[PDB]
Amino acid sequence: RRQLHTPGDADPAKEALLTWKPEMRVGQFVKNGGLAQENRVRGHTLRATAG
Amino acid sequence: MREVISIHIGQAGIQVGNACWELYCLEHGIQPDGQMPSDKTIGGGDDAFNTFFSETGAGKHVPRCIFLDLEPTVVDEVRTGTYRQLFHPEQLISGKEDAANNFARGHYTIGKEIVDLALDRIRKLADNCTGLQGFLVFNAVGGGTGSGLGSLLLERLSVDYGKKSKLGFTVYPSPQVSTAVVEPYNSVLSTHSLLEHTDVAVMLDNEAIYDICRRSLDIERPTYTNLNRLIAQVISSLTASLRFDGALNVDITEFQTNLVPYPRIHFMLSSYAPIISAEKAYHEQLSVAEITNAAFEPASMMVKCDPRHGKYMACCLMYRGDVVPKDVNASVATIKTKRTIQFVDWCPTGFKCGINYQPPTVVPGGDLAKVQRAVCMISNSTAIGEIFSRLDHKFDLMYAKRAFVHWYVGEGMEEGEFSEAREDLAALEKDFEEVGAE
Amino acid sequence: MREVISIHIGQAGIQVGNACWELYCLEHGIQPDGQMPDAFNTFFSETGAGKHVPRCIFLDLEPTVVDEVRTGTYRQLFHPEQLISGKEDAANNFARGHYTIGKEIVDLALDRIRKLADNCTGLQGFLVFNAVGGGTGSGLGSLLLERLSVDYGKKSKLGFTVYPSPQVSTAVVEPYNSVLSTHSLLEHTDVAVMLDNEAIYDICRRSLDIERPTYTNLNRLIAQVISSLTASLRFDGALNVDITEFQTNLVPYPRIHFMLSSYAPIISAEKAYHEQLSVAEITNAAFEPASMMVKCDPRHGKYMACCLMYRGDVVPKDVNASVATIKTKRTIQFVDWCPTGFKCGINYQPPTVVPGGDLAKVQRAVCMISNSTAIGEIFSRLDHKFDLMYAKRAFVHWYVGEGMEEGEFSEAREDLAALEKDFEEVGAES
Amino acid sequence: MREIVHIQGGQCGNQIGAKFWEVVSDEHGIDPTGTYHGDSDLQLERINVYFNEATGGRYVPRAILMDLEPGTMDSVRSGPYGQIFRPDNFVFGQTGAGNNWAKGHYTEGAELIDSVLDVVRKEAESCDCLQGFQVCHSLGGGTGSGMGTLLISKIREEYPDRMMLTFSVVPSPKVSDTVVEPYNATLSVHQLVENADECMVLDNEALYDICFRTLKLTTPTFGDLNHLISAVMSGITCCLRFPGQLNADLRKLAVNLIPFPRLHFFMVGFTPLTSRGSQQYRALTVPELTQQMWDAKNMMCAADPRHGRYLTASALFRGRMSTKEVDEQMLNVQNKNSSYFVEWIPNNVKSSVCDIPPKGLKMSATFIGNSTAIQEMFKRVSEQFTAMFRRKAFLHWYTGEGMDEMEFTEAESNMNDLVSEYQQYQD
Amino acid sequence: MREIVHIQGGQCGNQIGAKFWEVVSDEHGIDPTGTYHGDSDLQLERINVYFNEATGGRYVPRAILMDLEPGTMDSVRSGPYGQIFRPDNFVFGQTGAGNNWAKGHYTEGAELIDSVLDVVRKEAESCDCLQGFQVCHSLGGGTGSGMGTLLISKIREEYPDRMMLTFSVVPSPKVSDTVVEPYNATLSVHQLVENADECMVLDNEALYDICFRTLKLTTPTFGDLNHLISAVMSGITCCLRFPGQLNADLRKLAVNLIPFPRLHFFMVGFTPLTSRGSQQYRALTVPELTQQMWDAKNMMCAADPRHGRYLTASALFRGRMSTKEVDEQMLNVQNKNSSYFVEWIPNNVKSSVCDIPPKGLKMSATFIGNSTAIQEMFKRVSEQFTAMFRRKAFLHWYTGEGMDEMEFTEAESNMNDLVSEYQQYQD
Ligand SMILES: Nc1nc2c(ncn2[C@@H]2O[C@H](COP(=O)(O)OP(=O)(O)OP(=O)(O)O)[C@@H](O)[C@H]2O)c(=O)[nH]1
Ligand SMILES: Nc1nc2c(ncn2[C@@H]2O[C@H](COP(=O)(O)OP(=O)(O)OP(=O)(O)O)[C@@H](O)[C@H]2O)c(=O)[nH]1
Ligand SMILES: Nc1nc2c(ncn2[C@@H]2O[C@H](COP(=O)(O)OP(=O)(O)O)[C@@H](O)[C@H]2O)c(=O)[nH]1
Ligand SMILES: Nc1nc2c(ncn2[C@@H]2O[C@H](COP(=O)(O)OP(=O)(O)O)[C@@H](O)[C@H]2O)c(=O)[nH]1
Ligand SMILES: [Mg+2]
Ligand SMILES: [Mg+2]
């Protein structure tokens, strides 16, 4: 069959799972005077799920 | 998560919706085509909360709103206007023929077919959002689409979405400056449904905003465009605590527990304190104590009623801009020590103060000037019983020998449904009197 | 090695296959002449040096539609003798295509099926394409399916057929041809996937917002359903769902194998930028009743078993998370004796867009084929229309005079009469 | 070997604690990351009290942040000293209590009070010997009141022999912010009587008097009130973190203050508060600190100490002082004003001296006073309640999430008993 | 002198073991090509347990890759670390089971079970002394379940004195990937209760809950779910491949964790799981490993360990550590909550030490637990099995392959018998 890349591997945090790298850091962002908040690729579902 | 779904019913709902979404786009910097500029979107692509927009793919925002109206020629102007590429095309809902000032047509005959299609997009917007706080409803009770489809839609969201707040900004018939003959009929039947379905209803009156434009703005020639651009300023300042943070944030759910003391009593007045034209704003010193006095003036009320006639149950203060949290406290002490206004004896603490850190954004081409501070005052008063009693008097005059009844009777409704709304409004009238009684 | 042989019978069969193979050649990069400028072996045979032919036959007793393929843009693609033609059609008569004029062509069709079966190493199933409203779609479809079951035992017979709509129907004797088709398709076809013209009529009206679509616009998105079913064989994925996977995961009882079809994202070009397409939205849209490709109300029926084919950028939680939301939805209902009901498949290849088509480029898609008790509503309407015309024996002398005996109408009615009793028996709560 | 677990609840509790962890971290030399950079060796002697040692030398606070609205969890970590807190401790809701005591305590508590206990159980287990728990919240809202008292109810049944510090702000006499504020306080004080072993009373409008008159700040920031509270919350535990001439832990402060179990509400003042325009001219001495200590306006409560007698008081001195000078000054204020002190308790004021002053000051003192004058505050909250409850105004919300009117009547049962039990010692 | 023959069955087993050999070869220092490039002497001293010596320093796994479709075999070979496997070991059919358990056990699996037993024998007598056989498969499929239990039944009759490790992913409560999970699982567990010696129970949603709540990965696919299983895989046999202070081989884990011969199903969980942003805050020391190891959120099965008492448990600790501290830690956790451990077995936890930590960590642990909480995941499959079998739904596919309804009733009775004796020990 035709080989395709797995689409789930695009997450930067998943590039090395089960390794202890304490110097990995999390960024934040501000939206025009709004509340500064954590920047993830999909942080909304981690924050408040869906529905 | 903080998010609201705005729905706009009737001709007045769409025109207010055009003015409000023009204000929301300039608040967040969204361009009319629907794309935030490239310098703004350089940050994180995640959008953890936006109470009025949802991120679509890459850099595209669609409003969380539906434009439903039975007459196609009003929503088609949105569909051909400068905001064509902003709104989702399926979200704009048209119809074949308008209700034509008929509560019977908007609720039974022609409003029943389109309300199922309206609920389809509400469900498609409910699952898309995660934290739903409430529904914002914009309609005028004088029209058939605003009354009939407004009553039918709010009845369905009550059953489908239990315990969700439904804050409805409604336009009621004016004592003098009113445009329709059957406004007393449509407004009385609207209050039979708006009483128990909506959570909080903020009264808006047509000629009271006319008097603000003539006096404060010195615009001798005002139209509906000028009225809605500051009606929208009320809505944005009311919900500014969600989108932007301040010292004392006040959510939509913080309104309901602090403003209405009884389930049946949920009609509110509205006030916007600094409403100053361009040439008057520079010389005037817009201080916190100065605008707080102006918010409680009878002229600055957007409902044609005198607050001195009634008594204030509770007051909500939506402060915007550079406001330290004690000059609002110094203003409340000066307001509450005044004897011209009257707070009821059983409510020792009556003020709900909320502060936001952003000044109101001025609409380009608008009539308002850029001001550092703003106070949006929402109050519960017993003077609102003057508004419903006058509409009760006009409705009883024409119903005395049954004028304009064959239009309503023929289009589905029965004769006895007129008396039920009359009794519901009359029982509501004594409810306002007994709560103001000491 | 996996292969699959697709046959096409009737006016609807050739036109759908004319739209299926133009999508198949686009996915594999096959040019119209037949030269690619490892995954093509499911549908294309490697021929000589750098040349491919479709693993298909176009048989029809009406030579006009077959000659259109011969003079069309795909004259160099198809092998010339797979385009099997006949002298004159069955002409809306089941008895003609099954007894008199069907016999002269069914021997040549079976011979060429054997030559295609010998070329392929491992055959997984046969794809049939026919419309039961016509003569050769019903008659020759019944004859070829009967012979193919005996010649190839225990091999899956995947059925893609079109039933007449309750409202929109283009011939008078379609209820006569439909009932006799169901008798043969009941035991010979292993798995039947229903299609209805009027439901796919409504999808293009509402979702693709085109107010004058023709038969070409339907068959272009028919091919999207067929390609999504067999995308597991052609392309890799996290959860492959083969042809033999699709039989035992969807068919609980031997006589209950008719199924509904649904393709979730039906989005035009201008609608694509505005709508935020994600896995949760398309899973909601797949179960939406107006997105069903067969005109019936699934709210009336019970979801016996469901299959999901996810193509494109789909992570395995979002298919699992959406199914949890769909299972907790109350407007749909699953049958009580099937608590584990969801079969899901993820294919990593996004769907392709045809030039000049209406569907827009989407990152993810869902093809939903499910067994339901609402399918008995289709058979009730066809039984009512058939019983009305057979009440005083109208349009019967055409069938009786051409080989068929009178009692063959009665036994086919009794076959459908017991077929309704089985759906209400299996749908009854125990 | 004694440690304190800190819990912050609501909009008010999170911002007070963030300003508290702003101040208590710098005096031990921990930067906003967690690395020690102080210039003294005594700062690292007691890091365990408020910080957990982690890999790489990082110190993480023993802080649990709770709220029902997710906006405040953006407000804590994005401000100064916001990255020290553990992201696992960021436990929060999605809808917000919205100033309802019923929502915080009955409906929205049940999905979150299980989760906040798992963080507290994890943090208490990691410790070796808990000195006590310390919470800071508001009695005006619903998130820090209904849910805040719910944790206090559920933590005393698990740890009954450990102390419970509550730093709770109350409704104000003059000007307020929430309409249903008397409803939220009367329910919360009803819970706070039996479980909280000691309570600290705060209010914003006493701090407004302190900021405008003593510190003379022209336009004080809303966080400038928090810095007065934060200096106190560091001052109660000042003897724990550092050595001193007179050792006084949280237990010795507790056992000396309360004569009887129900009189655990205290009013607190902070002594060395001088404006920047006159900080050169002020000489910081023990007679200077004590004179500013016993002043009515220097207290952080609306209760005037002149109205009701001081039942028992305590002072926590920081810096280099003389034990004879401190002891003779505390005897001077009792002998000069004996009518304002209770007669049947000799030696009312118990003083403690710590040899490490706070940053920027050579001498400091935090004053704790248990007096019957605070009954004026609780009666003022109670008289606002009886005006609203007699007509059942703003009660259909509270009964919406499950509670009955009986719990409202029982709220005034213990509130009016509390003010009557305070009253019997004033006479 | 002890070695393990690895068997992989089905699409899941081929994919799970492909990541399993990814982490083992990286741990033992084998490059993707096949040679050795490790810089430690302890890596190469024990490589015959999983690898066979080849010409030129090449190492080949003892992996028999068996299925019924050629699609899954090509995907394993095309991926990274997939070229180390022996192409002769790639045994496969052509048609495919299609998740029909009867097809993989009787019809299609019969003409391949002679071919796969030919090559597992070739791996067997080639090496010296077999420690046991490790097989990874599913219970909901038909290729790895129907044919997998066919291999296990034959490999137990051939070699009846060797160990048997089964890593079976079980059907899920909340979500399903196929429709015939209750039919396949009840038939497979019936074969697994007599044939298999000890079982690892895995489940995808608990892997999903681990990588969402704990790891805070918002979009993990099957790629890193198997990575979680792969760390579990290497944690079981860490005693064999590396030395330690306390050595406990696969027989010692078998004798301790199995009190009675039908008490062989266990749940498993990997200890040091922390989200990427919170790695700096979490210190890496044994007491905070133990609280995560015993946490109910860390179990990779659907069974909640709080519902059922622990009959016997074990910890597979890896890294530099102290036995004096681990022994009291295991004693403390048995005394903190003694209600969750069974009474008639003292010292329910047997712990082992491995001095070589896994790659990227300085300390780790693997938990194997025999608790009666696994009756929950079995009885719901039994509940779903009785739902369809009484209506004979999806049974004509199974009875067309020769298995009549008698084996379905026998599998139902044994499944009900297995949960009958789990509850007899909880009481
Ligand atoms: N503020 C404001 N009020 C408006 C505007 N347009 C209409 N109104 C109010 O609406 C009343 C007219 O009836 P509508 O509510 O517009 O009629 P409708 O909702 O479209 O119902 P139908 O005409 O039957 O379709 C007038 O008396 C106005 O008070 C507007 O643009 N701005
Ligand atoms: N979707 C789709 N349906 C078609 C198409 N052409 C015909 N049909 C359906 O087929 C029905 C007619 O039956 P057919 O089997 O196609 O008739 P036939 O194949 O010409 O049979 P003969 O006349 O004997 O050759 C119509 O009612 C249509 O619903 C097509 O191109 N696309
Ligand atoms: N001193 C001080 N008071 C605060 C702070 N934040 C809020 N408050 C007070 O808390 C009262 C309302 O608290 P609220 O936000 O309703 O608490 P919650 O809703 O239960 O979380 C207001 O009157 C404020 O004066 C703060 O940071 N410092
Ligand atoms: N752990 C894990 N489980 C998987 C993976 N892929 C599929 N599965 C599980 O396997 C089940 C489907 O079984 P299947 O692959 O058809 O079995 P097979 O026919 O023997 O290969 C599903 O319930 C999945 O939970 C994977 O990559 N990792
Ligand atoms: Mg109109
Ligand atoms: Mg034809």
Side-chain angles (χ1 to χ4, degrees), chain B residues 248, chain D residues 10-12 15-16 99 138 141-144 177 204 222 226 229:
Chain B
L248 294 165
Chain D
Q11 285 75 243
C12 177
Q15 297 269 40
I16 283 184
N99 292 162
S138 52
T143 302
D177 294 331
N204 322 294
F222 188 71
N226 290 318
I229 304 169

Side-chain angles (χ1 to χ4, degrees), chain C residues 192-371:
Chain C
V193 170
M194 294 298 112
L195 296 166
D196 196 308
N197 278 138
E198 203 263 353
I200 312 165
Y201 279 180
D202 204 5
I203 298 187
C204 296
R205 278 298 316 285
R206 296 182 69 252
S207 306
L208 279 176
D209 66 18
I210 44 172
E211 73 285 335
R212 275 89 167 269
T214 179
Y215 272 132
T216 314
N217 297 351
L218 277 73
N219 299 353
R220 277 182 191 271
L221 64 89
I222 295 298
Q224 272 291 339
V225 176
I226 317 303
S227 160
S228 187
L229 177 139
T230 178
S232 166
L233 317 176
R234 320 202 304 280
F235 314 112
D236 77 314
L239 287 175
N240 43 11
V241 180
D242 300 331
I243 303 299
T244 177
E245 206 81 38
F246 192 71
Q247 269 79 67
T248 190
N249 276 311
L250 278 300
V251 183
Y253 285 64
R255 294 183 77 259
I256 304 164
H257 49 98
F258 322 99
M259 281 195 281
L260 298 175
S261 179
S262 299
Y263 199 62
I266 315 292
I267 303 300
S268 67
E270 54 94 18
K271 201 58 75 155
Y273 312 99
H274 290 308
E275 185 46 77
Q276 187 264 330
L277 275 298
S278 174
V279 176
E281 283 83 344
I282 56 183
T283 312
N284 294 352
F287 279 77
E288 198 272 319
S291 176
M292 201 73 72
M293 301 269 277
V294 184
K295 181 49 69 71
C296 80
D297 292 345
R299 287 189 315 283
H300 286 51
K302 307 283 285 294
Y303 285 160
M304 187 160 296
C306 302
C307 200
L308 300 152
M309 281 78 77
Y310 281 58
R311 294 187 60 228
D313 197 334
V314 166
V315 300
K317 313 172 306 304
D318 285 342
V319 58
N320 292 326
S322 304
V323 167
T325 61
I326 301 299
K327 192 176 285 185
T328 53
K329 219 197 191 156
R330 304 317 305 137
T331 179
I332 73 158
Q333 186 63 255
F334 269 41
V335 75
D336 48 7
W337 45 256
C338 185
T340 288
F342 276 99
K343 169 70 176 175
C344 63
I346 310 176
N347 294 320
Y348 282 1
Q349 177 62 41
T352 60
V353 59
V354 291
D358 204 2
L359 277 79
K361 182 66 177 177
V362 291
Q363 287 86 16
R364 56 193 63 82
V366 173
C367 171
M368 203 277 267
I369 311 188
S370 170
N371 189 11

Side-chain angles (χ1 to χ4, degrees), chain D residues 301-339:
Chain D
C301 177
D304 202 341
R306 272 82 52 81
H307 281 150
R309 55 189 66 252
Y310 264 109
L311 194 58
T312 310
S314 172
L316 321 170
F317 282 99
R318 318 186 59 180
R320 202 63 52 100
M321 285 147 298
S322 302
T323 48
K324 184 180 75 173
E325 183 71 30
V326 170
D327 289 346
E328 80 173 0
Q329 198 51 47
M330 286 323 187
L331 194 59
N332 274 345
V333 67
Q334 299 182 29
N335 294 353
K336 183 69 176 178
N337 296 319
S338 60
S339 83

Side-chain angles (χ1 to χ4, degrees), chain E residues 193-420:
Chain E
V193 58
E194 291 88 5
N195 297 294
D197 197 12
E198 60 263 17
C199 172
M200 295 298 103
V201 160
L202 275 299
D203 213 352
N204 297 110
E205 70 276 16
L207 265 63
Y208 278 138
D209 287 331
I210 279 181
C211 59
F212 181 71
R213 312 163 37 82
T214 80
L215 292 177
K216 293 300 207 61
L217 301 179
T218 183
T219 177
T221 179
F222 291 166
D224 53 357
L225 299 181
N226 306 353
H227 204 317
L228 292 176
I229 292 177
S230 87
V232 175
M233 287 284 190
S234 182
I236 306 301
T237 65
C238 75
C239 171
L240 301 183
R241 316 179 285 114
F242 290 114
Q245 296 161 356
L246 192 151
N247 263 350
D249 50 352
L250 263 55
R251 188 174 302 266
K252 272 303 154 182
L253 277 296
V255 64
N256 285 315
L257 294 168
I258 302 168
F260 288 81
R262 313 186 84 243
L263 278 295
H264 51 286
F265 293 93
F266 317 123
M267 78 287 291
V268 71
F270 196 33
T271 295
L273 312 179
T274 315
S275 66
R276 317 301 321 278
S278 56
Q279 296 202 353
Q280 58 176 353
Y281 308 93
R282 169 77 80 92
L284 211 44
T285 301
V286 194
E288 50 263 30
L289 262 69
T290 304
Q291 57 93 26
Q292 192 166 357
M293 181 177 71
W294 285 102
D295 189 21
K297 267 79 69 177
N298 211 12
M299 296 300 110
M300 312 203 94
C301 167
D304 174 41
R306 300 185 300 251
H307 287 108
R309 296 165 72 190
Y310 270 106
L311 292 171
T312 307
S314 70
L316 269 291
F317 269 94
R318 312 183 56 180
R320 304 308 303 122
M321 38 183 271
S322 305
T323 43
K324 50 195 166 69
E325 192 269 347
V326 166
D327 198 68
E328 59 93 13
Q329 192 86 57
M330 298 301 112
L331 179 61
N332 198 7
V333 65
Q334 292 180 357
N335 297 354
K336 180 184 120 164
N337 53 4
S338 59
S339 58
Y340 285 146
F341 292 98
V342 69
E343 197 268 333
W344 62 274
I345 304 190
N347 206 347
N348 298 278
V349 172
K350 199 41 84 187
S351 58
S352 66
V353 189
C354 184
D355 48 20
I356 297 294
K359 183 175 174 66
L361 291 98
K362 51 179 291 312
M363 201 164 324
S364 86
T366 309
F367 174 76
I368 298 169
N370 186 16
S371 79
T372 179
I374 51 180
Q375 71 186 358
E376 288 170 337
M377 48 82 57
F378 278 132
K379 75 165 73 71
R380 54 163 61 95
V381 178
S382 176
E383 182 264 349
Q384 285 165 357
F385 178 71
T386 54
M388 326 181 76
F389 181 58
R390 65 160 47 77
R391 302 269 315 187
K392 293 183 184 293
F394 293 100
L395 189 149
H396 73 272
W397 296 110
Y398 286 82
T399 190
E401 302 323 293
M403 172 179 275
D404 58 355
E405 58 96 20
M406 189 66 203
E407 285 91 6
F408 276 74
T409 58
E410 286 291 327
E412 156 182 11
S413 75
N414 277 47
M415 262 294 309
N416 288 318
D417 182 74
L418 177 77
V419 301
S420 172

Side-chain angles (χ1 to χ4, degrees), chain B residues 358-374:
Chain B
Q358 293 189 351
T361 66
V362 60
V363 187
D367 300 329
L368 261 52
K370 179 179 220 62
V371 289
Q372 298 293 321
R373 296 161 261 269

Side-chain angles (χ1 to χ4, degrees), chain D residues 157-206:
Chain D
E157 58 96 19
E158 193 159 338
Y159 302 93
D161 45 353
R162 318 262 48 81
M163 283 286 164
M164 204 69 43
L165 263 173
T166 76
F167 288 87
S168 54
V169 301
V170 303
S172 163
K174 312 170 184 175
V175 290
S176 172
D177 294 331
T178 66
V179 179
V180 293
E181 206 167 12
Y183 273 97
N184 299 321
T186 44
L187 298 163
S188 62
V189 173
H190 169 90
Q191 311 279 357
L192 271 186
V193 158
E194 68 269 13
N195 49 19
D197 287 348
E198 69 273 15
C199 191
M200 298 318 181
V201 165
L202 267 296
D203 50 337
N204 322 294
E205 270 66 20

